[PDB]
């Protein structure tokens, strides 16, 4: 970096009212100086000022989704369920189905040292969430072959952040990709935005480093372009994508019912919900806003809409379609990302951000929250999508949604509720297949059963819970 170049960038920053990021250049090594220059060269402080301004100095008709845009597996015609299952498996067997795992979370409520997908919830197998998910992919590729007599590939695109990327890659490598082919698993990274003081100023982590944070799960779309992942999908002939969150231990990865349902309705986007468990559950609610499909995040909803009651049913929530972060896209939808990625709004959250005191140089952790994180949300493409190209499908919580949000000891959405849900699931499947569990719960490996099939061999047999059915 020359003097002219360093000076021209300084000017940009100074003119933008962000000159303080250069206030310790005085006392910097030649390479700490380049760390600062290179990182500042990758932000436009004017767009930073623009974001900071909408966030800090900021400027609906609201009904349930109409029944044309909604379905449920709890009351679908069984002929439909069967047809959707079959079509989903055929699309898997045609190598047209990809999976995008959103694993860009630091997992702050869980306070673990490792990525959340590495977490062992205490199952007898001691498998991670990542491994459980990989094995569902493996098992579904096998089920697909049973009706093609040919290999079935579901590529697995794993989206991480700066914080999770390296440990995620090491973990996958140390487990030999959980038995999948390395060449059908791509680990990529979401982008970042700088953290912002309450007063609009870029926070500095050190005297040579801007404080940045992941740009939210809504960062998926831009990261699909710049990572090369969308191009890999085009190359492989992918036409259908299942996107989910890593923290859900029950997630039906590439669920064939979901895929076949969406593909046969020819939507651009579909999404899963469950019945909200109470007014206060920390879930987005899917609904119709200003004529369009939309989500209100739990952090942005008002008490009155969260607590509104169904007129005919005075104890049931009016808005109870809980977002479980299981989305479908057509590949064609991803072909349009350049035209609307930029229109995704920035959600704001107050944060305690450790930084350099501006003036002192003192690398302090703050008492009250001293700034803000900006995040895009994955579901903010929903109102971009016509009702007729959108579908929402209700599923059963007990089979499809068990999130790991909190640490052992919390009492909900934690490792013990997760463990209990998998093992309770496994016992239900066995009991349906004819087995007898003595006693709690049973862990069924995904390689044995994806979704409750293949357990005939257990008919008549007694199983002493807790148990583990594997190879
Ligand atoms: C932007 C986004 O994906 N938000 C999701 C996500 O919330 P968290 O901020 O990750 O707790 O998971 C919830 C399900 O556990 C879902 O209800 C919500 O809408
Ligand atoms: O409110 C926020 C938020 C907005 C911006 C950064 O974090 N969240 C609440 C739940 N969804 C994701 C994070
Ligand atoms: C009729 N309705 N509203 C939310 C949800 Br779930 C359902 N099934
Ligand atoms: C093809 N296309 N263009 C804009 C949007 Br939204 C979509 N889905
Ligand atoms: C009223 N509503 N919203 C999502 C879903 Br399934 C339903 N039924
Ligand atoms: Cl669309």
Automatic annotation (TrEMBL):
InterPro entries associated with the record: Nucleotide-diphossugar_trans, UDP-sugar_pyrophosphorylase, UDPGP_fam
Entry keyword ATP-binding: no
Gene Ontology biological process terms, A to Z: UDP-N-acetylglucosamine biosynthetic process
Pathway the protein takes part in: Nucleotide-sugar biosynthesis; UDP-N-acetyl-alpha-D-glucosamine biosynthesis; UDP-N-acetyl-alpha-D-glucosamine from N-acetyl-alpha-D-glucosamine 1-phosphate: step 1/1
Residues forming coiled coils: none
A single MF term (Gene Ontology): UDP-N-acetylglucosamine diphosphorylase activity
Name of the protein described by the UniProt record: UDP-N-acetylglucosamine diphosphorylase
Native source organism of the sequence: Aspergillus fumigatus (Neosartorya fumigata)
Lineage: Eukaryota, Fungi, Dikarya, Ascomycota, Pezizomycotina
């Amino acid at each position: 970096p020359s003097a002219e170049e360093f000076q021209q960038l300084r000017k940009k920053y100074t003119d933008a009212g962000q000159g303080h990021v250069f206030a310790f250049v005085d006392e910097l090594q030649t390479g700490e100086r380049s760390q600062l220059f290179h990182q500042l060269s990758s932000f436009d402080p004017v767009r930073i000022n623009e974001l900071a301004d909408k966030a800090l100095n900021p400027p609906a008709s609201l009904e349930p989704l109409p029944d044309i845009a909604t379905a449920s597996i709890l009351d679908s015609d069984p002929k439909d369920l069967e047809q959707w299952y079959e079509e989903g498996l055929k699309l898997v067997a045609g190598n047209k189905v990809a999976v995008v795992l959103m694993a860009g979370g630091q997992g702050t409520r869980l306070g673990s040292s490792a990525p959340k997908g590495c977490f062992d919830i205490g199952l007898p197998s001691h498998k991670s969430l990542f491994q459980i998910q990989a094995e569902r992919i493996a098992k579904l590729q096998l089920l697909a072959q049973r009706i093609s007599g040919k290999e079935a590939v579901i590529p697995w695109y794993v989206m991480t952040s700066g914080p999770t990327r390296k440990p995620t890659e090491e973990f996958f490598e140390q487990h030999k990709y959980f038995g999948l082919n390395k060449s059908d698993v791509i680990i990529f990274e979401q982008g970042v935005l700088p953290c912002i003081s309450n007063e609009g100023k870029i926070l500095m982590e050190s005297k040579f480093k801007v404080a940045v944070a992941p740009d939210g799960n809504g960062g998926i779309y831009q990261a699909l372009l710049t990572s090369g992942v969308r191009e890999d999908m085009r190359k492989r002939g992918i036409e259908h994508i299942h996107t989910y969150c890593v923290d859900n231990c029950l997630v039906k990865v590439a669920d064939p019912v979901f895929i076949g349902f969406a593909a046969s309705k020819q939507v651009d986007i579909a999404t899963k919900v469950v019945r909200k468990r109470n007014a206060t559950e920390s879930v987005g609610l899917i609904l119709q806003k200003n004529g369009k499909p939309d989500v209100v995040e739990y952090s942005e909803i008002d008490k009155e809409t969260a607590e509104a009651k169904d007129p005919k049913q005075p104890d049931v929530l009016k808005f109870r379609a809980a977002n479980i972060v299981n989305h479908y896209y057509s590949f064609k939808f991803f072909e349009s990302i350049e035209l609307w990625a930029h229109k995704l709004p920035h959600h704001v959250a107050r944060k305690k951000i450790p930084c350099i005191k501006e003036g002192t140089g003192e690398f302090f952790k703050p008492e009250k929250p001293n700034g803000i994180k900006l995040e895009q949300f994955v579901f903010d493409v929903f109102p971009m999508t016509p009702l007729e190209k959108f579908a929402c499908i209700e599923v059963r919580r007990e089979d499809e949604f068990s999130p790991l949000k909190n640490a052992r000891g919390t009492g909900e959405d934690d490792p013990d509720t997760s463990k209990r849900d998998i093992m309770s699931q496994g016992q239900r499947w066995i009991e349906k297949a004819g087995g007898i569990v003595i006693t709690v719960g049973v862990e069924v490996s995904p390689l044995i059963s994806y979704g409750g099939e293949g357990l005939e061999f257990l008919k008549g047999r007694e199983i002493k819970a807790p148990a583990f059915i594997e190879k």
